[PDB]
Paper text:
Kaposi's sarcoma‐associated herpesvirus (KSHV), a member of the human γ‐herpesviruses family, exhibits extensive cellular tropism and is associated with Kaposi's sarcoma and various B‐cell malignancies. Similar to other herpesviruses, KSHV depends on the envelope glycoprotein B (gB) for host receptor recognition and membrane fusion initiation, making gB a prime target for antiviral antibody or vaccine development. As the fusion protein, gB mediates viral membrane fusion with the host membrane, triggered by signal from the gH/gL heterodimer—a mechanism consistent across herpesviruses. In this study, the high‐resolution cryo‐electron microscopy (cryo‐EM) structure of KSHV gB is presented, revealing a unique trimeric conformation resembling the postfusion state observed in other herpesviruses.
We determined the cryo‐EM structure of the KSHV gB ectodomain at a resolution of 3.26 Å. This breakthrough was made possible by a novel construct, gB653‐mut, which incorporates strategic substitutions from the FL from HSV‐1 gB and mutations in the furin site. The KSHV gB653‐mut ectodomain, analyzed in our study, adopts the well‐characterized postfusion gB structure, forming a homo‐trimeric, rod‐like spike. This structure measures ≈170 Å in height, with a major and minor radius of ≈35 Å and 24 Å, respectively. The structure consists of five distinct domains (Domain I through V or DI‐DV), spanning residues 53–653. However, a certain region (411–453) was unresolved in the cryo‐EM map. We identified three pairs of intramolecular disulfide bonds (C68‐C528 in DIV, C85‐C484 in DIII, and C315‐C362 in DII) and observed no inter‐chain disulfide bonding, indicating a tight but flexible trimeric assembly. The FLs of the wild‐type KSHV gB consist of two loops, LT‐FL1 and WFPGI‐FL2, characterized by high hydrophobicity (L‐FL1; W, F, P, G, I‐FL2), whereas the KSHV gB653‐mut FL, HR‐FL1 and RVEA‐FL2 from HSV‐1 gB, incorporate with polar amino acid (H, R‐FL1; R, E, T‐FL2). In detail, the presence of acidic (E211‐FL2) and basic amino acids (R129‐FL1; R209‐FL2) renders the lowest bottom of KSHV gB653‐mut highly hydrophilic, with a negatively charged bottom tip due to the carboxyl group of glutamic acid, surrounded by positively charged side chains from the amidogen of arginine. This may stabilize the gB653‐mut ectodomain in a solvent environment during purification, compared to the wild‐type construct. Domain III (DIII) also consists of two parts, DIIIa (I72‐ Y92) and DIIIb (D454‐C528), featuring a central, long helix forming a trimeric, left‐handed bundle, providing strong interchain contacts.
Residue numbers in the entry:
A (entry chain B), B (entry chain C), C (entry chain A): 53 to 410, 454 to 653
Write the structure that this text describes.
Amino acid sequence: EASGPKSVDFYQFRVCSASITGELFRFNLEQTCPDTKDKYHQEGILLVYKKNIVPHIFKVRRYRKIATSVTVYRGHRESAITNKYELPRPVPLYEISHMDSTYQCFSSMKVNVNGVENTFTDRDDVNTTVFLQPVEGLTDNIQRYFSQPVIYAEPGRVEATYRVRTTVNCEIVDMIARSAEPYNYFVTSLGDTVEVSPFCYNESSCSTTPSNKNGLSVQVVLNHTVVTYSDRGTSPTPQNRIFVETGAYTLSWASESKTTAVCPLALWKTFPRSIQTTHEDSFHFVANEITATFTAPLTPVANFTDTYSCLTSDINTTLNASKAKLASTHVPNGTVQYFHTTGGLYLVWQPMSAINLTDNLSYTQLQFAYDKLRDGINQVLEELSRAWCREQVRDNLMWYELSKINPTSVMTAIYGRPVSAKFVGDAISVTECINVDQSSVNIHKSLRTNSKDVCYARPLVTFKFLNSSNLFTGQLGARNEIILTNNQVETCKDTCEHYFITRNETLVYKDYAYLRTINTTDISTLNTFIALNLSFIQNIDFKAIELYSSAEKRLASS
Amino acid sequence: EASGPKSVDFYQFRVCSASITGELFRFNLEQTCPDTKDKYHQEGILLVYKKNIVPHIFKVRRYRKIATSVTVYRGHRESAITNKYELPRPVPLYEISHMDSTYQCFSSMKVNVNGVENTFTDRDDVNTTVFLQPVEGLTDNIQRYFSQPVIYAEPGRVEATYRVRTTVNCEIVDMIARSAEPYNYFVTSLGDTVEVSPFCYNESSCSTTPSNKNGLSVQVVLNHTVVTYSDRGTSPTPQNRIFVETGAYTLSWASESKTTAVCPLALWKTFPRSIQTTHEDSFHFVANEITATFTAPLTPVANFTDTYSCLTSDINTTLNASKAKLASTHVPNGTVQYFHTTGGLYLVWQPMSAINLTDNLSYTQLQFAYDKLRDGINQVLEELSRAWCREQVRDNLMWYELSKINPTSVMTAIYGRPVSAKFVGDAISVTECINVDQSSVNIHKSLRTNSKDVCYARPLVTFKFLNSSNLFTGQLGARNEIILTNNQVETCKDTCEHYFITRNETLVYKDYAYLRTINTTDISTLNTFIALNLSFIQNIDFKAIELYSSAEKRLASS
Amino acid sequence: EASGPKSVDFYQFRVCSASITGELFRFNLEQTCPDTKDKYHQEGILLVYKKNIVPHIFKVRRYRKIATSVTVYRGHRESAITNKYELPRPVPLYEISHMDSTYQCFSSMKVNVNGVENTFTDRDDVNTTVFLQPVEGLTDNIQRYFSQPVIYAEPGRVEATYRVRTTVNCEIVDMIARSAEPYNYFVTSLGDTVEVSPFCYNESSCSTTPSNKNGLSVQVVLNHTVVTYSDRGTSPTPQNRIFVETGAYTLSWASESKTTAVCPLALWKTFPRSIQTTHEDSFHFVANEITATFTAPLTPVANFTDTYSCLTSDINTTLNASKAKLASTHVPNGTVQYFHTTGGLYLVWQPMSAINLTDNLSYTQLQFAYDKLRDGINQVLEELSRAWCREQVRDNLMWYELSKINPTSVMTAIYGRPVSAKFVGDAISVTECINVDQSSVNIHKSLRTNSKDVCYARPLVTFKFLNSSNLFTGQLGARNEIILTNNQVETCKDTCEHYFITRNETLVYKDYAYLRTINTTDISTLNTFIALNLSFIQNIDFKAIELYSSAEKRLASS
């Protein structure tokens, strides 16, 4: 019979009506797609905790001994001729400053010098007692106490060279001291600076009963029992205290432990409603009250949050208050957890389940905006996909309905390669197609057959079965296809017009016979397209903007 | 007849050809959707106003009296043996400093002491007049004036103990003072600090003719008429002035009101082109020159912008200049308005209508980017929806065209539930379908009927009308459907092959009679689907980045 | 014949079956769309370079002469009665400080005074030599050297007025000095401030052999050969040095050029993998390790990066190391380039080609996020467009397949205006349509014709050919269309029902004749629509958030 290569494109004349049954195909009349289930999200109370920066504040008492002399008797009687060194000295502990601590009196006429011990006073006893008194000042936190505040005698009489009048003074000053986070040194309000740790001699090292230091003393007293009330003596508890003897003054302050006094964690904000969304390797806590999102590693890095013993007595109260407020429509679902974000902030998470009726913080806002946009885009894509699936199902149903007329057209539409088909029972049977000798083609110039009013609907063709020596007569179909049975006939009509398509050339029949071959493109080609004039997203550039120039910053000064 | 439950799925054999007319349906041949109208947006000139931080600057004049003594005559003749207290004193107002104000001379030999009034001088008159003079220095803003600048006599002769030579000095210093925003205290360039308000005795309280203060004087003089020109005397206006007598010096400066001198609002930028878009409860002003967007509440919070009386004379000029520049293609459309953003910046809005031919600022940039992305996405969605509507209209038209062959298939395609329909006149009439007894089914194993070449196209079936005792003969259709009229016949063909679908089982007829029952899935099922391999949007994490570490910040120091 | 206006809508009765051939149209059986080619992107090593802010650090040596006296013999024998001026003086260059530089001895008894040269000492020779020695202190960077450290003699014997004991001291202090970026002035660690440039007398101006300045000296010495080792004398190289003689002390430091010592560019980070994407007028370098993107102008603004001569010896090493590490799978492709971003950072770009197997930084993160979102959206749009093109091609094929039954319906579906078409061979010919006289219309109330069981399928109509005086008989079709040939007949059926449509009115035929005219809307209209319930993107507002309030900032203090 006829054999050869199988057709793969609509460019070579081919004929195929073989009765050999091929593959069997059926239309999938049942098709559907489901709807995704909503992914529920956990919620609960979220608390943040920024790093504290407020310095530690405590009160400190200072003692200082002042000795001054005036020598103004130049000529007959001069005034303010010259002044002495006025060197101040630390208060000695000969009486352990017990009288000063009593805030009642003190021993004047201090004796101390680098060369030899010499007593300086107003010509009185070496260990005379002078009653202290408070002096008012232009300060609400410096209750200075003065003894012998008036200037020296300064006789100003007729003296040859100068006078020798001099007095001594005892000074008790109350001030406030502040220390940084490391708590290794602190500076008082007056201005003095000392390089010792405020926390010592109480659950801390670098302090002992003997007095010894590099330029200091660092002496600790057990149950000092400071009266601490010069205006009205009282009976306070003998609290512990320490002393530091500098080169010119002595400072005293109560001893306290580093723990249970100051720890670096302060509450910033509380969000009664928050959403936690898991991810590949991190969490996401949403706080829409300030439009920010905090990310933390999946593992609860704060596995030992019991070291921060301070907050164990306040985070409980805040959580209790928040859950009491939210108890109307929410209940706890699990144990509390502590996380640690990359920015240095600590998060406290307490998941809650609904009850059935029956300055570097810009990246958080950026993350929030990105998450919102991504969620919106994903939801839109999901809806579009569902609509497309429904449309595809309907389209397939139409296709099946259309296939009931001629399966060959539908099969050639679905598969790019031309094929052939027939409705075996209720099942399409697909067979391949076979070409013929392209050179051996002959088309009659007249479609008018014998008799009358029975003219052929399509021109008759003759060809050879490829690699064979034989001739057959067929009728030209469509897309360069040959049909063995020539049953296409029609009644003759006056001024009949006909056109045919054959690859890049066309045939024209103004009458029952014509060969006005013209180009295929000469006839207009209609289009059925719904253009999608989509507009892409332009890409822009961002520029840094500074509110205040460097000139204004310099002009700010201090 | 036959009655029972109505079919709801393609799983039970059913037959329905009832002549009772049901509901009437017609194809909506006319369908269309409109295009949304563009929402025009207001535009106009927008000006921002940041909070001023530049400190107030004004000139201040200082007067001070200096008395010093030198006693160097130790042994035979010593030098620099000792110095006096050199205590400086404020300039007294015995002459009301009129001579000093004249910048011509001053009264030397000042007499003042805490004990008793003693006059110190170079052994001259108590009220002797000494002419002032200017002294050059290494400063471009300190025109210090000195009288008696040379050191004391210091005889250095043969004296037993020391000398008594001493002189006095009058000092006039011109300096510059700066004050913070509250204007409650200020510090001069020299270094002195005073806790009085720079604005006083002129539209301000805390100032009166009597001199009285807590450690100060705060004296006001009416029409002081300061010459203010030591190099060349002039005749200036008698401007008002005030004085403050400290413990060692006196400061003077001209009095000015708090208003009309310094107010905290400075212009930052001007945008001749901006867009205002309304929202649910806020406005949105777009400034694309710096890629930022400012949001303000809907209500014009700056309802009393007349309090800032300073800007009423400059915002008018800037607006006039901008509108003069833009008058080529724009004209004003409404009255000016003032807003107040959440960040603390003040906005000035002046809408303009086109003329017909015939450091915390990152959130603004974030808002700008979010708005741009949202607008682009919304526009894309609108275009997609319009294209989808056009496609749906065309699809409905194609469905109506297809319905002209057999309405039953189209109706069963549109409605999931199988139905029976027909073309009454030019309107489809749909009727419900009725099942039969599933158990009472019988299919003949041979489709070859009597005579020859008239074999049945489909096998004949027999069943009972559900809840009834009767038998009927029908022909099997498709999707388990029965047809009463058995007119499906065809010419007998040798080696005829047939297949049929019945729920999960199939029938095979290799000849005019066969019962090779096989599974339905044995035959391949072709697919007609255009997969939408959409790619979702991945979610990433942002990390904080610091340009300079804390070590570099510490190394910066001052 | 019949002529008049051409129909443009389905609202007027029209008839058109003209034999005149119109335009020729053919179905474009071949249609396809291509897939976009991936745009490859360059990659290579990217290095950033922030502006350096670390101040310059160098060592400085200071010399100072101190003279002090004590006069304490008041009464019989007093102590610390008074002190002298203790005026310090700069070390003179009588010996050019050669002995001090030798760190072995120095000439005591300095003679200097404003009045007349007087020698002060401990009653010794004017040019006596005293050996220097080092004194320990509480500092790890101040190796102070002291000569005559003990206090003056202070006889304290029985003297009438006072003593005259006095001593002099030579001080050599080693300190560290730091200077800002402009390098015009610097301040030492001790506290002294000098307004001279650290870089002078070596590839710099403002320095010369003669000593002259405004209050200073600025003297340069060639090959000073400072021993610089008091603990153990050595033999160092005679390096150059300079001196500055202040009013009380002299400072010395080694001279160095501004270049080759300190230049303001420090490496911040290195990214072995980066992507460069071109744009309209700028580049885009992606560094996903910190999620940031840097933008630079298209032109290599750093066209003269050879001025920064420091980095030419280190950027080469870093690039060599990075390319050695990446040589496993990458090789260089071009020459190095230098860019300059808008934020003030400098970028170094070195493109690399893969080898074939055979604190203001938020805007960068914002740009990165925007670019990622834009790329994702664009990719999604491209995929959607490709899927839509495939669907459109399939739809057009289905339309062509459907057109084989009746071209009139397909043509009227594609073109809104009704037309008339008829297949012409392979192609088709579509003509226009002509209306008739709307008033001249008559529809028979009975569709039952002569004989029996041959009743008309559609009612017969009679009308006039618009602007003409004639009558014709036709059959009503669909959408107000008239057909000349009345061949629509059917067998008579009992209880026949027929509804027909006509603009806004309908006809009902309960029997072979009826005129129950009712409204068209009375019959239900079925719909075939797949709703696209797209959800738009909500627009939100961002609010500025401050981590630490101003109160905490004030409490931080210093």
